[PDB]
């Protein structure tokens with residue numbers, strides 16, 4: 240059964256992958272080899288070419304991602320060789336440095352050994368490799384509420400945060416055979432952060448806002464031809480609205496709109512003044528300006544949607560079905576100013592792809 | 602078959618309606634009477650109470666409507682007695698006057714005789730009773746592009762627009778047995794319009810924008826207990842974003858964002874300046890301000906979403922399933938600033954309800 244599903248997924252992936260790589264003639268013999276490997280071993284091992292192309296296909300098939308035009312330039316790092324926690328740490332440190340690239344962000348994925356019997360070899364606890372801690376006790380809220388449960392789990396393990404609003408969480412992961420994860424503080428020299436200033440409004444710096452340069456999502460599973468890479472952190476560059484309309488704006492995140500309204504000099508008293516909307520726009524302008532000024536890659540939602548339109552055109556021209564999740568593709572500010580809002584998308588799930596998986600804490 | 606569907610819909614509607622009206626004991630005898638009427642006549646006639654409550658249920662079940670908290674206060678006008686085109690005209694004129702109510706808009710529906718054998722008794726051609734004409738010829742675009750086909754159909758019939766950007770379309774409808782519709786110019790004394798000014802930016806009036814006071818949607822079909830009221834125009838008051846983020850903003854409508862950017866004194870050259878977003882906010886602030894200043898009812902999207910949350914709570918408390926269309930419920934500006942964005946909704950279709958129907962032109 241288990242063995243059956245794997246073979247099926249393998250046939251479908253190898254056929255499609257080799258077709259796109261112009262290697263269609265090599266399919267029959269590769270499939271032969273795979274069949275034997277599965278019979279003999281219970282699993283099979285991707286070639287470097289298969290793994291690289293699979294990770295790229297998986298990004299291409301990510302319905303919720305507006306940034307897919309660049310799927311084929313994904314930088315894929317093969318770390319299936321790691322066996323120790325020092326190696327995993329160093330690979331994660333390396334991913335941060337190489338993806339950051341002094342501000343000129345390279346979309347990158349680092350791929351660790353896959354689940355074996357559904358048994359994880361490496362289990363990453365972080366949601367993103369770089370993220371801020373959150374605390375909630377005695378009515379006191381500090382940092383990022385979205386990080387409260389992971390922060391509490393880290394502190395169970397002997398980590399202690401300084402309780403600023405921007406404590407960097409340690410890297411935290413567990414190896415097969417260890418009962419507990421280990422944690423490592425991030426070297427601050429590896430982590431680019433951007434202070435938020437406004438191009439016109441000088442008081443904006445009074446808010447003392449900042450955000451980190453690179454979102455490196457580290458808790459999703461990459462599935463390629465029936466092989467489950469549960470540990471495979473990847474990154475792009477930010478779209479500005481993720482920071483300005485959600486991370487810094489949401490009431491359940493940093494909740495900064497009233498403070499923004501105050502520093503930009505507008506009242507926050509009447510819904511009809513659209514003060515939240517006006518605050519959102521200025522905060523989002525501040526975020527784009529600040530990343531650009533520091534030389535850290537970022538895309539605004541208009542440019543991003545323009546790129547996505549080209550992705551749609553490229554899909555059509557290549558003869559591939561396009562899939563998408565309208566509810567995630569539309570940006571959270573001025574969505575009707577983008578073409579995405581005015582059409583519909585088929586939300587079918589195509590593999591390879593990235594999937595959610597259960598958290599090991601909570 | 603036809604006769605069967607009707608009876609089924611009737612049983613389900615009468616049972617639910619009388620239950621809500623505390624008239625459950627009267628169901629058995631009412632259903633008896635209806636059964637006979639259908640056998641004998643092919644159809645059945647709603648009581649005033651059934652019709653009124655059915656139209657209210659239909660609004661309550663409109664998945665795409667954010668304004669549903671007020672479903673039970675719908676003003677229902679029963680015009681099943683009309684037989685002539687002068688009567689239809691006068692009923693439509695009356696609806697405009699009574700709904701407008703000197704600016705204090707009353708949500709109202711005027712209900713005309715229903716389809717008989719699927720044969721319409723009255724066929725309204727207008728999308729809304731009050732709307733602006735649109736023209737497109739020789740590269741010249743004037744008025745509302747959304748009105749181009751209806752405008753062309755009106756001019757086929759001897760109507761002629763002045764070719765301002767805001768020509769009011771005539772009322773246009775067809776009676777059973779007439780080969781052609783008739784048209785009647787709207788008396789300007791019945792139509793409230795609001796000039797768009799900005800609370801802070803005096804130059805905003807240079808754009809010479811205006812919009813009409815009351816959206817009176819006149820091309821949907823009301824279905825109640827298997828009876829098809831294809832002619833049943835209804836209105837609420839506007840939510841400001843419908844005018845400011847769509848009618849005046851969309852590239853395929855009045856397309857005013859570049860002109861807005863110019864009068865508010867910002868460049869429209871770089872996506873990263875978020876000039877479209879900033880223009881959207883100021884235009885939307887202008888719209889709310891202008892309606893309020895003139896004493897014409899309007900709701901902003903924050904207040905509207907707050908009302909909708911109460912509608913959700915009321916549904917739960919009354920033991921009714923809530924249905925909704927997330928993609929239409931979210932406002933087109935700052936959607937993530939509303940609770941709607943952060944939850945999901947079951948998009949099941951429950952009857953009574955309002956439905957699309959084929960246009961008689963195009």
Ligand code: HEM
Nearest residue numbers: 298301303304305306346347473474475476477478538593
């Ligand atoms: C190159 C720059 C990129 C940009 C600007 C971009 C933009 C975005 C945005 C805005 C979202 C929505 C996230 C949210 O609202 O929570 C998203 C979702 C997503 N992106 Fe991308 N992305 C990029 C690169 C990548 C890469 C390199 C991958 C993987 C190889 C990826 C895979 C995804 C996935 C899987 C999701 C959905 C996650 C979920 O379901 O929660 N993206 N992207």
Ligand code: HEM
Nearest residue numbers: 660663665666667668708709835836837838839840900955
């Ligand atoms: C009282 C004020 C009301 C407000 C503020 C309101 C608000 C809205 C808004 C903003 C939409 C979305 C329209 C679009 O984006 O194209 C909508 C859709 C709708 N509303 Fe309401 N509404 C109100 C009253 C009513 C009334 C009185 C009815 C009928 C009795 C109604 C039935 C509907 C229906 C059927 C739709 C969907 C139409 C379609 O599918 O195209 N609403 N409403």
Ligand SMILES: CNCCc1cccc(OCc2ccc3ccc(N)nc3c2)c1
Nearest residue numbers: 306454456458459474475476477478481
């Ligand atoms: C706001 N939704 C949070 C829930 C959630 C859970 C797990 C992963 C996840 O990823 C969002 C995500 C994923 C990949 C991205 C790549 C680039 C980018 N700019 N944003 C990206 C954002 C998001």
Ligand SMILES: CNCCc1cccc(OCc2ccc3ccc(N)nc3c2)c1
Nearest residue numbers: 668816818820821836837838839840843
């Ligand atoms: C933007 N969608 C246009 C397509 C379309 C076709 C037919 C009817 C229709 O109604 C939108 C609609 C319906 C009822 C409304 C009631 C009140 C209100 N403020 N807006 C309302 C808006 C909309």
Ligand SMILES: [Cl-]
Nearest residue numbers: 454481482486
């Ligand atoms: Cl993020």
Ligand SMILES: [Cl-]
Nearest residue numbers: 816843844848
């Ligand atoms: Cl409208």
